[model samples]
Target: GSHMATLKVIGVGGGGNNAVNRMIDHGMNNVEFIAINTDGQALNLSKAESKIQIGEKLTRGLGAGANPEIGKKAAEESREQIEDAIQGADMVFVTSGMGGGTGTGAAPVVAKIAKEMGALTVGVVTRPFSFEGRKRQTQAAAGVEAMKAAVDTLIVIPNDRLLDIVDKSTPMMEAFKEADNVLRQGVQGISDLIAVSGEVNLDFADVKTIMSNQGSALMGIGVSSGENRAVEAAKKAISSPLLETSIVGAQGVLMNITGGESLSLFEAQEAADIVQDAADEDVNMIFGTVINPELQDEIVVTVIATGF
Candidate 1:
């Protein structure tokens, strides 16, 4: 069963479902969406290739109600289906917002199963706000630690930082939208690395090598149009808020520049150089480009920075 498909993005719980739902609406190719949850109502509304409900005997489709123990037990009883959902993946991304039932409990268990099956696992989870209180905050931290033990790489978003990016005037839905955009950018970088076929190609091997590295990483996407598109896009990608690092401790980078046929080798190298400049002097790098006709006079740069 070594035939890992292009990619499988599984969203667990409410937060994960909401983010993935938006991504599907925005359009993604060569990717599959699977939604898992304890709540029947939420799962009913989920727009994904596969929708699963677990712990029917316990919660009776009512949800775990913040009790991680119940979430874990439900998943344990339903592990067969969980394993089946993850079996064909080569690179698995399990996403959730930790602290609450389904996200805190089952998400780590799922990541662990994916890893055990030989897939390169990545965990994308969120920690709650300080106002959410000590109990939930502690649970969130524990969930993150559990995920780290199970996955090759971990990307975590803290709810405490939401205010840093948006004001009180911003609607709750809009703030969530912003978070979804960030997750989309991060996951899209991995997708770009998977499918990019360029002259100075960076392949899955290059990505696996970096991801096999266990530590915090910086990942983001940038888009720029018109003159000097490549270089400007590179700068913006490096500066994007999607990455939570300072680029100070970065030991390596995987940069992919996507543009139309009019793009030149000089421009590619130009952008690559700008990207490497922001990292450590001895940074190991793998650069690739994707030639998309829709890019027109624009270039989209996706930077995956790791080691910080």
Candidate 2:
């Protein structure tokens, strides 16, 4: 019998909270949502199953006031609560919106604590849009650099990349939602990779070997069908959306291919080849193939490259 690995997604600060809310809306199975924030009001609005409002004495039950230092301080002082929140997790994802005070400062602290607790910690964060000004961008870069050593794998999604995929007329809410979907796909991909008992199963150990302290990571998910579905989906998965850097020299990769009954052995091999060709030679790669009858004619490929 296969034992399903326990998974926890912790949202830090405002942006992190929003991502958690979106994840809840989408529906996740065998995953717990935890939200930590300095602002009580914001925490109240969150849809997370568990919420922790930190630094009440320091911030007077308010926020971090756009200061990363304050955010870090809050997380530091609230270490006990953070540990309690992260307890008993096999794998943890620290989600945050980088740039702002709370998310920027608090997120790394959360990731560090989770990593310290012996969980495979993945930090998924978003860089601010270009229009948000150089100040925020600078802060976000610094935050990312700080977080590099704190988590097993760090996945950064640049908000400005939204322009590449959407029209100028797209509403602000819609554009942000699209950005949220990137993180959502990442979380879901890993969940399916480890939990799903596919034809070729990838268990927790495979993911841990690839992701543990591997530094930066990139993820791409593609869905397509018809004659060239396998190639197209793999191509899209490698290209991915909102990814900040190239996967040209990644040290390891975890790729999962899901399709319907018609999915052929040749098609799986073809898709795997396309993804492998994009990364460096001698890459440590683990892949799993699943036959999901609900998929019909579509083929979905999710690729996560690490140690860049």
Candidate 3:
């Protein structure tokens, strides 16, 4: 009664397409990648297995030029192809960079179609840099609201965090790559919950209950070792730069801990308790654990707080 989960990642717009390429380069296992773009050149450059040049009739293969309306119209014009790409997915992750025309507009539409088609749709989007201007930030915020209405869960990573997290001397390209790295981690955590069998199990049902119709989600992963490993790891996750706010009011939580043979029952309980204590007493919580000998004394904790 078990099989591999069908996971599809659809990248919309230039930033989204770049994320797909980075994810592929990072080597995600058992996930299909698709890139959709209004710009023919962007579409042609994507490394995703499937590529669609949307809105040929509307944009004539030209870019959206920072205009969300054109991006929306282009996606609407090519709804059939979008439908075909997402048809049999058990979970569809719609990734985009909000603020610009294509992703800010088309990502919400793609998520809506995937949701309508009965897939568990999740949105992973990045807000524009502060240097990108106030108007673009406003547009990105609006796009996030639109995406929230269509997906089961939405994870918004602010590009401004890049400025805070990376060293000042880091190149611009590396900072962008850091943001993409965060997206890959989110995808990997959710997919692992469904794809791997564990000492403590969480099924697709657990994911659905925690994420379905939940507005925004906050997720993080941390690794540590030694006597205070559990506490340190949990603290790192809860204080992740990717999270914009605290988990004080979250209605649900999904936590997974992986450790070496040295992992103890006390340590696992302590790790799970840390996240659970951050939320309300009545929050619906699901916990899972795995043991990997290669990890030695190190422990890794991945937590997703939802229904905020």
Of the two candidates 1 and 3, the one with more favorable lDDT, higher being better, is 3
For model 3, state the Cα shift of residue 198 in Å.
1.4
**Candidate 3: TM-score?**
0.95
Task: Compute each candidate's TM-score over C-alphas.
Answer: 0.89, 0.94, 0.95
Q: For candidate 2, what is the TM-score?
A: 0.94
Candidate 3 structure lDDT: 0.85
- Residue pairs with backbone overlap in model 1: none
Residue-pair clashes per candidate: 0, 0, 0
- Expressed as tens digits, the lDDT of each residue in 97-187 for candidate 2 is 9998888898999999999988999998899999999999999998998888799988888988888878869997778788887778877
Off by over 4 Å in 1: 1-4, 240-243, 261-269, 292-294
* Model 3: worst 10 consecutive residues (lDDT sum): 237-246
The digit string of per-residue lDDT tens for model 3 on 1-308 reads 67667888999999899999988987998789999999998788788998988878877898888889888888888889999988889888899999988998899999999999998888989988899999999999989988988899888888888888778699988888877866687678778777777789877777778778888887777789888899889877776575564677877888888888888899878887788787755677788888778888788888888877
Q: RMSD per prediction, one decimal? A: 2.6, 1.6, 1.6
Count of backbone collisions within predicted model 2? 0
Model 2 superposed RMSD (Cα): 1.6
Model 2 gets an lDDT of 0.87
Best by lDDT: 2
lDDT of each: 0.79, 0.87, 0.85
Per-residue lDDT tens digits for candidate 1, residues 1-308, read: 22234577888888988888988988888887889899999899988988879888989888899988887788778888978887777787888999998888888888877888778787778888889899999998888888788788888878766777787699987877777776677777777666656766777777777777466666777789888888888888877353345555677788888889888989888888887777756678777777888668888888877766
